[PDB]
Amino acid sequence: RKKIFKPEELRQALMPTLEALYRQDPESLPFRQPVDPQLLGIPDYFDIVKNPMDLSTIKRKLDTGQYQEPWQYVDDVWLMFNNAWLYNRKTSRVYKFCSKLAEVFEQEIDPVMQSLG
Ligand SMILES: CC(=O)c1cn(C)c2ccccc12
């Protein structure tokens, strides 16, 4: 029989992994709010990043039952990373900070995924 997830239980299981990302200081700072290309003066951003994602949007989704399965949450976290790694220079602050968050995410998401299945 296939496992089905209750919204508050999926939120409780995944939230610690999101909190771990959000608490990285300074590395979460470029990711705590959506990229605003108008405010940052980068009109080319949405020509490269078709599906923006950031930590505040991931949290708002985890809080409002928008993830039905844990892998939809994992997909959004990787989308945030892959956007940053495509747009930014490899030794830029944003790219280096992204790679730190991805290290933290990998080290934390594995037991949670095993425990959820
Ligand atoms: C997440 C991301 O790509 C970026 C976040 N900030 C604050 C930026 C500033 C310039 C270029 C890219 C970004």
Side-chain angles (χ1 to χ4, degrees), residues 4-5 7-8 10-117:
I4 188 154
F5 300 92
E8 78 281 8
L10 195 55
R11 168 172 182 260
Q12 188 165 259
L14 299 173
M15 186 68 70
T17 71
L18 182 60
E19 289 172 345
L21 300 191
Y22 213 96
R23 280 161 190 174
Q24 301 309 304
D25 179 357
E27 292 98 346
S28 69
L29 271 45
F31 303 96
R32 289 183 173 177
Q33 62 299 317
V35 174
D36 187 328
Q38 190 243 300
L39 290 185
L40 294 163
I42 46 171
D44 59 355
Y45 185 78
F46 290 145
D47 300 329
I48 292 302
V49 172
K50 308 302 178 65
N51 300 115
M53 189 50 52
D54 77 289
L55 293 171
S56 78
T57 306
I58 291 169
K59 190 195 178 288
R60 180 190 222 169
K61 282 177 77 168
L62 196 56
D63 283 347
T64 58
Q66 296 187 34
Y67 300 116
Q68 306 300 255
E69 319 209 51
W71 62 262
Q72 300 176 308
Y73 165 78
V74 174
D75 280 353
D76 269 355
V77 172
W78 282 99
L79 169 63
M80 178 181 80
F81 298 156
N82 285 149
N83 287 344
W85 286 327
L86 176 66
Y87 183 76
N88 295 282
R89 280 193 49 180
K90 176 167 266 174
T91 57
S92 72
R93 173 178 178 266
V94 171
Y95 193 117
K96 288 177 159 203
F97 283 16
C98 183
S99 296
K100 168 67 175 169
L101 298 194
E103 295 173 24
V104 170
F105 190 70
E106 285 182 23
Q107 181 73 32
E108 295 243 357
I109 196 56
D110 264 36
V112 172
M113 286 316 261
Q114 173 169 75
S115 164
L116 285 169

